[PDB]
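PROTOCOL LOG
Step 1. Enter all chains and additional molecules of the complex.
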Amino acid sequence: TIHMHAYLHKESFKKRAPKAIKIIRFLAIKTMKTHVVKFDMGLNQFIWSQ
RNA sequence: UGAAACUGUCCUUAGUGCAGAUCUUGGUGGUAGUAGCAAAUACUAAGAAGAGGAAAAAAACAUCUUAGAACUGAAGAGGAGA
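Step 2. Run joint prediction.
Step 3. Record the structure below.
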């Protein structure tokens, strides 16, 4: 569970959803030790639902 | 180095000697990898082509298709003329 409100607290509004994508890509790099991270279509759309 | 013209002496001739003219023309420095590349709400994910996203996150990736999110808001960032 990524507590995203910790990362996107007091972030500029127009750079919230794009920065949410970056944070997830960082956690995947720091966990699976890989660099080629491929988001799913469903995950992208949920971030942009709001 | 250069590869086909040139030199010394005597008279004669002069468009004859440059550090300046905010001199003329051309080339080039410090400034300096500095000031900047900040009006017009905004981009993200998957795939394709391509030498052109690699990697100890090098945090950013132009073009086209799909999906999401959006802007001009119809006296428009629409469709047409002089």
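Step 4. Note key features.
Residues 13-15, 17-18, 20-22, 25-26, 29-30, 35, 38-49 of chain A lie near RNA strand B (CB under 10 Å from a C1').
The longest helix of chain A spans residues 17-32.
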